[PDB]
Subunit: 296 residues, 4 copies
């Protein structure tokens, strides 16, 4: 329990004010809101936090504030990944300094790097994490990095690696990873297949939609544990109706908008080049916010 | 049953040393499947090596399988060819032989518009003279990438009664189920069967069902009884087998296991498919004996 | 001589009931010859071979040989997914007197590179002496070969050429560098001029049926160091290809040939559909333009 | 006039991975001395994506001090963030660059409309310096259609397109649709063919060590001498063959190191060092190129 990273953890969004600067008050509210719905932990500074449109200092500012708000209460994983190894090392040291339970790093992107280079990248960050377990981050869709199973097996067996965030829809590979690593903490990365992902071998998950309905995902975990497939399927279906909408509106901004109507986020904008939500979607988003609030 | 839902084995085509149809082995394999308690057979698809077969050779298999299983288990005839006219010929034969349904892969190699794909299916449905159509979506091998909207249009064409979904995208599997509550939806990738059912599929069609169809029936049963653990354990066992078949070559590996089970005389596939590497024989023989003992 | 040159990928004319239109096939063969084409690539993608039976493909090979053997070079594409079917067509091509055979990498089912090699070897054996033209077309076949694999295939005993249907002109140059004497056919008409500059010494294309003389003109212009002329010819070819891509390439070509009084009924076989009637004006005008120019 | 052959500048670092100002200046002067038409600074080749904004500005400022008014200077100010890209664009203006450039924002999926506003905003901050749209699908993961490309290149303020694509049919289509557009060939290994298809110049990393060969191909084709153009492209490709084996940027830095231009031939981590088995070939190449010109 004290060091168990297994569970349902929300990929935290980063609230900005009207001038696109960090909205500290809204960030703190989002953190407490997540804690309030019984989330197991928070994955901070990942893709969902718009880390790649933030500077290093801005990312450390978020990490620091989140730690003040939730250290001790729930598990905290800091995504310190950057294309640059040096930059990633700086964020890792900060994460440890702030008291995070673990660090994570997306496979470095844009430039083609050999597998050996990817491995040394992780080793160097692990060194700077000085004790904090590393969560390997496999998300080929956005990174463009396509690892094989043998390569994935090598990464998760590196000293200091304590988990794998599997943002892949291949549930055959999910089962193979579980079979090869019975004790590995394995996070399902695509919210829209959560139930199936757990059935294949994942033992938890990390996702952006957890910010507005994390309890549903917890419900699925419970349902599958008790053998209630009907309930598990029903919950996944409701999640997917929501995801269908968020894909039309834009996932991050759609979530920020729902959180805005829930009185958590002051201004629901993402950073440019991200545009605003198309006004034609507001009635559905408002209706969803109302529904979720009644449900919770 | 009075419907097409269920666990259907994708039938393999046994050949002799001369690469010619081995009827004796074909009949044995059909009876073997029936004995395993399978719900039906999907004949003339990828697994039956239909694409390295002539139209008349595919028709010959359809006739014999009908003679062996018609009235005993459901029979689905895959009549798909790149050509619409050739697909129609097989559909007419399937009707004459008394199959319960026809199926057709999205025509491949040449790029065709979605409208042309739709007219392709309409033409075949016409020739099937009443038999329902099972749309066959397998982007990995066909190279045809349909959107969800296109899949919805295809499954709602007059005469279409089901969809064989050979795709590992379980978000799409759930979306299809949500849009069509009564649709017969077969899971296509054996290695994700359990997850596929949980996502919305209500059955499946697979090549590995030939040697362990009872395991898949078991997963269906377990999930219906809310026994998640048993369903997972069964899927894990199937995947241990699939891992092996992928190393040896799936079709030839399956035929080799069937050989050791005294079903298939000569486990060869047709060229350009090569033989199984002899270094795998020990593992394949051990698997066959393990499966026979299991039954 | 040799197999280098501008070879037209032959189309297969059909009658009202989607059956071979023998009279039109003969006219198309003679039409190509009159354009001054160096040879014909028969039974390939362009001939709609993949929607024809072995018997139908053989019939076409036999007719074409009757019409052009001894007048121009003839390459028989005998490729099928099945090796045995491929060998049957190879044996027939030999019987009819074709100058060479060709085969697309077997598709649909995934095959190991060794299986691909054994496939070509078996067909070469059945070609009984005729040189093999390896056919690399990843876009349609789905088979993605590496340079080392391409090198291996082109040096197999019996291989005499390569039809490179790829827009990767770096690989085109590398292939020419590794094999200075290899017959190298440019497969994408829309980059013909650039392909030759990169290393190809000829080409095979469907659009050669209606404007082969233009490609012959590009070969000549480059040979004589006339870049501007080569560029202008390519631009004119691309203006045509732009249109053909909108209308559908094969049916668009057959429709142009119809207006040229060569093809009776310009339909392709189902599932291919007819040309959208809104394009008829453009296609007819193009036919008119080409006849004037020619 | 932005037409021409321009080297994608590399960013030299020291043993501790920090900018090596003296080598940076040496490389700029080296390019000038060998006759390059201009420099493309802060692009993929300059390892901009493993640098901070302040570090990229530092490079832009130094290069400007070294070559403004001597050769054309194009600043790649592209970042995923629009705001960040604008800061660099404003700086490029202050330093006196002749133009700015921006790769299509990556990692996160953006709508074409969002891509358009991104460029408009950067163009606004460039305060007068024309924009060079940068299409490179292989690395950005952004696949634009011809129509979208046409829309981008017609935006107010855009004066050129760096086409890093091996599709020469599209290259010809772009040239046909835009007769006067400055179109840079992006893949050095197909330079000759890219020019024949419609490019009227190029931008590339290998220009740092053999820019004159590309200048030679331009001349050859203009003079209708195919033979020489092909021979030159072939020699360039023999070199590119090697650089792909060693790793392009570090291979180039190594050659430049043996030519006494770059003090330390390292790229920033995660890039690893050059495999020692390749040094004999790299030393020989350096010797060859120094004796050649």
């Amino acid at each position: 329990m004290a060091t168990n990273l297994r569970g349902v953890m929300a990929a935290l969004l980063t609230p900005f004010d009207q001038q696109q600067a960090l909205d500290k008050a809204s960030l703190r509210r989002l953190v407490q809101f997540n804690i309030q719905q019984g989330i197991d932990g928070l994955y901070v500074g990942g893709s969902t936090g718009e880390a790649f449109v933030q500077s290093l200092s801005e990312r450390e500012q978020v990490l620091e504030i989140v730690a003040e708000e939730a250290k001790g209460k729930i598990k905290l994983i800091a995504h310190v990944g950057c294309v640059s190894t040096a930059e990633s090392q700086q964020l890792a040291a900060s994460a440890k300094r702030y008291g995070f339970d673990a660090v994570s790093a997306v496979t470095p992107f844009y430039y083609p790097f050999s597998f050996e280079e990817h491995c040394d990248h992780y080793r160097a960050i692990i060194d700077s994490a000085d004790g904090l377990p590393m969560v390997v981050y496999n998300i080929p869709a956005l990174s463009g990095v396509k690892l094989t199973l043998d390569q994935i097996n090598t990464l998760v067996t590196l000293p200091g690696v304590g988990a794998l965030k599997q943002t892949s829809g291949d549930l055959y590979q999910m089962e193979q990873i579980r079979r090869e690593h019975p004790d590995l903490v394995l996070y399902n990365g695509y919210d829209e297949i959560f139930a199936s992902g757990l059935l294949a071998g994942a033992d938890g998950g990390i996702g952006s939609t957890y910010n507005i309905m994390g309890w549903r995902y917890q419900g699925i975990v419970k349902a599958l544990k008790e053998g209630d497939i009907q309930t598990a399927q029903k919950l996944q279906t409701e999640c997917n109706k929501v995801i269908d909408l968020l894909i039309k509106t834009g996932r991050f901004r759609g979530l920020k908008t729902v959180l805005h109507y829930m009185d958590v986020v002051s201004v629901p904008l993402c950073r440019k080049p991200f545009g605003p939500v198309d006004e034609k979607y507001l009635p559905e988003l408002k209706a969803l916010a109302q529904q979720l609030m009644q449900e919770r």
